[PDB]
């Protein structure tokens, strides 16, 4: 009752923004966030490759729609890239036609709006690429910080010039192959979405950047059981089993992740079992005092990792024994993180 | 032999610097401010609560009109707030949700957003089409962007997890100055009320005074026991204060070339995430990872008050240009405007 005509309109704007945020939030909720940590060459690929072995979880239909959106974004970057690359040269070239400058203006005007692919502007990149002067300046232009995938932005003009796109994997690889920082894998499983964040070669301080990720559904940690007899290459006095345990101990007890679930995958259990009969665990655990039988060797190692948890009464540690020829390896984590999420929301309400 | 001889020279030079600083410590602040009237019991209260973020808040910055704020959270969107009416003016989608920093351009025409992708995106808000678009993508850093601040239109300074800061020419999209010499990752920047001078802190328990135009470090300040989390200038531009993981805030003076004060208490074991001064410079604010913000008497190091209300770690703290109100934010996804 005190607002001006404009103040009321401004309030409607704010409410419509809240509406869009609320809708976005509901859409946002479904994906499971998984953080993948552990030692290098640890059988992590076996987990990932197996998820990638089936390929049922391909580019989703909806995801394909996003890709059509990705192609539109990359196509706009392609057409501005070629008219920009030829306008920023240390050595200029003559154009095959004086009309090319008018084409550049049209591309730069359309790219400035950054809406959608225009067929006439798709014609420009096709003609500029054929023009020997535009191609000739590439050998000088490529001296700058160009995207390694930049060749695809131009070379694919034949298909990304077509208003009706058919998406492919290259359409997102253009930006994924950059491999900058943490790189997540986006996949689905039984109508659930997942993003598993692959952390490798972080350097710095192992635990400083990560704190921000508190709230991740689970941390995924991998150990290769059959490699217990190998000594760490970086430090010839340390067995690889102890390097994995030091990482586990320093990660699982981080105050940033007090009750965050951990799912421990112990890989190569079959090669492990067929080796403990020849080389007792005392090669890496001299304190081991058991027989060369799986139920004792596998239980000992599991216990050694579980005894690294200083919050046993708060953080649950899941253990699964994997091999290269199984289907439970991928179903386990699917159900396990679903149960973690249910356990978490039951904790939040205090019902549990 | 050549390497050791340089080490020998470095050892003598470091001792000469320390001795030059010790010779200037002719008084302690406890001998100077002893008879100043106290600030007394300061009870700040929330006047606005801003709701809408669906994720942990990591960045918040005051606009120069004292009315608008820009904030960013891990939900991958920027929001421009009208602090007077708790209205959302803009909501800007990001192409990467992993945001660490944002900045409100002093002219109000642009905002910055950066993060784990090592690229600072400059958004044009004062558009004719009605939407908000990225004008430039300032790529070329090799580490995460912990902080970015505008200096002027088309001029921005960025930090990096690659330990090097850079001054960007936004219109051309190129680096013009790089600031090398830090040992650890750069955690935060602060600009003086003079765009030719700023300070930075990094994960090496050292703060450095940088000359924007020369690109040189002019002073190095030490004393922290752990990584520096936040830095800000004293309002007069001749001093600054830092916070760190050692739960002590420290006050340094450029011309005295030494630490002047420390702010701590036996019952504080919590890290500092943000610091700022009030308009007069008499009240020192700091946010902590224990969910609260404190109020320190900048001339005595006594406790003057507590700002409690957040239910999670404090991530953002700052004061508006006219000193009228303080905004804070935390990992509980709310912003609060105090007083």
């Amino acid at each position, epitope marked *: 009752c005190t607002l001006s005509a*404009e103040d009321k309109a401004a309030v409607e704007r704010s409410k419509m923004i809240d509406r869009n945020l609320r809708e976005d939030g509901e859409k946002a909720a479904r994906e499971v966030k998984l953080l993948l940590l552990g030692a290098g060459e640890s059988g992590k690929n076996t987990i990932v490759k197996q998820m990638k072995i089936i390929h049922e979880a391909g580019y989703s239909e909806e995801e394909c729609k996003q890709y059509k959106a990705v192609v539109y974004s990359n196509t706009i970057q392609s057409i501005i890239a070629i008219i920009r690359a030829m306008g920023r040269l240390k050595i200029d070239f003559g154009d095959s036609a004086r009309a090319d400058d008018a084409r550049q203006l049209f591309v730069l005007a359309g790219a400035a709006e950054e809406g959608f692919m225009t067929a006439e502007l798709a014609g420009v990149i096709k003609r500029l690429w054929k023009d020997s002067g535009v191609q000739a300046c590439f050998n000088r232009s490529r001296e700058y910080q160009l995207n390694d995938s930049a060749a695809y932005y131009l070379n694919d003009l034949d298909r990304i010039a077509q208003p009706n796109y058919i998406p492919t994997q290259q359409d997102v690889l253009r930006t994924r192959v950059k491999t900058t920082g943490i790189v997540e894998t986006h996949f689905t499983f039984k109508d659930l979405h997942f993003k598993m964040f692959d952390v490798g070669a972080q350097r710095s301080e192992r635990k400083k950047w990560i704190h921000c990720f508190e709230g991740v559904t689970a941390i995924i940690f991998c150990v290769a059981l059959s490699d217990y007899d190998l000594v760490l290459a970086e430090d010839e006095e340390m067995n690889r089993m102890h390097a994995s345990m030091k990482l586990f101990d320093s990660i699982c007890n981080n105050k940033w992740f007090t009750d965050t679930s951990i799912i421990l995958f112990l890989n190569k259990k079959d090669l492990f079992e067929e080796k403990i009969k020849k080389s007792p665990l005392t090669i890496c655990y001299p304190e081991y005092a058991g027989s060369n039988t799986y139920e004792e060797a596998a239980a000992y190692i599991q216990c050694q990792f579980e005894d690294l948890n200083k919050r046993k009464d708060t953080k649950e540690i899941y253990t699964h024994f994997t091999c290269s020829t199984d289907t439970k390896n991928v179903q386990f984590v699917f159900d396990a993180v679903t149960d973690v999420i249910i356990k978490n929301n039951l904790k939040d309400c205090g019902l549990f | 032999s050549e390497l050791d001889q340089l080490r020998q020279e470095a050892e003598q030079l470091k001792n000469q610097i320390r001795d030059a600083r010790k010779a200037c410590a002719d008084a302690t602040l406890s001998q100077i401010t002893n008879n100043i009237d106290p600030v007394g019991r300061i009870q700040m209260r929330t006047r606005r609560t801003l709701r809408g973020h669906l994720a942990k808040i990591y960045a918040m910055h005051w606009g120069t009109d004292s009315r608008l704020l820009v904030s960013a959270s891990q939900d991958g969107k920027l929001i421009i707030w009208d602090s007077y009416t708790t209205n959302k003016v803009h909501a800007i989608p990001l192409r990467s949700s992993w945001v660490m920093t944002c900045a409100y351009a002093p002219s109000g025409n642009y905002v910055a957003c950066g993060g784990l992708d090592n690229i600072c995106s400059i958004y044009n808000l004062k558009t004719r*089409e009605g939407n908000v678009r990225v004008s430039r993508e300032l790529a070329g850093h090799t580490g995460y962007l912990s902080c970015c601040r505008f200096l002027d239109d088309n001029q921005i300074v960025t930090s990096s997890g690659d330990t090097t800061c850079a001054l960007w020419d936004i219109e051309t999209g190129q680096q013009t100055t790089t600031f090398t010499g830090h040992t650890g990752d750069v955690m935060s920047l602060s600009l003086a009320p003079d765009t030719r001078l700023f300070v930075s802190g990094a994960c090496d328990a050292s703060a450095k005074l940088w000359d924007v135009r020369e690109g040189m470090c002019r002073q190095t300040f030490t004393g922290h026991e752990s990584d520096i989390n936040a830095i800000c200038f004293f309002p007069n531009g001749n001093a600054f204060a830092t916070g760190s993981d050692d739960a002590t805030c420290r006050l340094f003076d450029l011309r005295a070339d030494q630490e002047l004060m420390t702010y701590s208490h036996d019952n504080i074991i919590c890290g500092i995430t943000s610091v700022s001064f009030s308009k007069s410079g008499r009240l020192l604010l700091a946010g902590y990872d224990d969910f609260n913000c404190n109020v320190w008497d900048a001339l005595k190091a006594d406790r003057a008050g507590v700002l409690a209300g957040h239910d999670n770690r404090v991530s953002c703290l700052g004061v508006t240009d006219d000193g009228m109100a303080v905004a804070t934010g935390s990992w509980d996804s709310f912003l609060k405007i105090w007083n």
Partner: single-chain antibody, 231 residues
Framework: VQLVESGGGLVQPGGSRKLSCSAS????????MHWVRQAPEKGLEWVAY????????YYADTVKGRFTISRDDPKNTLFLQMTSLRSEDTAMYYC??????????????WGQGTTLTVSSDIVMTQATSSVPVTPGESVSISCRSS???????????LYWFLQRPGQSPQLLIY???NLASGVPDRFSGSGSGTAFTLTISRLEAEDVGVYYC?????????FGAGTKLEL
């Protein structure tokens, strides 16, 4: 940013017609729209408003019950459906773009105009309506309101427009002192209460036209008759 409206022509009394406007070049779905119609004998008259969202629509009382405004975002098309048309409805109809938020410019872009031919609050006032001016001289004009235009929030909601021969109106000044984009700094204004002024430092040939002032404090919206700053 372009807004073109077509669909006019001549009708008989009591009939109906639909006008439309095709938008391009801007975030159509984020903007509201006004219809403003210009009668040769009267000048600008406000007709209807649709919010950038939905559900909030206003009509002038002179068209209420006969006009319907609607918007279809998927086709960037605005519609105006009119029935029971009368001779009084003969006017040039403009689509006017408007967006509201802190610091917005509510009347920045205007369309070109569609002619409708039919066969057969707060009142703004002005003095003189035709001040002779020579290029190179300064100009000072003013208008008055029947109601104070100052809101308790500290803002005054007075707008100044210029229309040149053969052109649609363009915005010069909004909320007393703020210039619209593209407006030379020759233009300024000030005032208080119910009396406000517009100043031109130097009269240039491009400044010759009819100036309007209007309030945007409360609905309905109204216009002054217009002052013609010709030599």
């Amino acid at each position: 940013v372009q807004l073109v409206e077509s669909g006019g022509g001549l009708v008989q009394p009591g009939g109906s017609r639909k006008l439309s406007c095709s938008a391009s070049g801007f975030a159509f779905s984020s903007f509201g729209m006004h219809w403003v119609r210009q009668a040769p004998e009267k000048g600008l008259e406000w007709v209807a408003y649709i919010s950038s969202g939905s559900g909030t629509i206003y009509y002038a009382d002179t068209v209420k019950g006969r006009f319907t405004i609607s918007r279809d975002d998927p086709k960037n098309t605005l519609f105006l459906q009119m029935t029971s048309l009368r001779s009084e409805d003969t006017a040039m109809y403009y689509c006017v773009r408007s967006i509201y938020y802190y610091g917005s410019s509510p009347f920045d872009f205007w369309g070109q105009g569609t002619t409708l031919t039919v066969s057969s609050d707060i009142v703004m006032t002005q003095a003189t309506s035709s001040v002779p001016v020579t290029p190179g001289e300064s100009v000072s004009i003013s208008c008055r309101s029947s109601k104070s235009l100052l809101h308790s929030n500290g803002n005054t909601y007075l707008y100044w427009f210029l229309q040149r021969p053969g052109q649609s109106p363009q915005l010069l000044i909004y909320r007393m002192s703020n210039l619209a984009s593209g407006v030379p700094d020759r233009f300024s204004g000030s005032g208080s209460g119910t009396a406000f002024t517009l100043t031109i430092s130097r009269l240039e040939a491009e400044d010759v036209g009819v100036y309007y002032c209007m309030q945007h404090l409360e609905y309905p919206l109204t216009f002054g008759a217009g002052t013609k700053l010709e030599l």
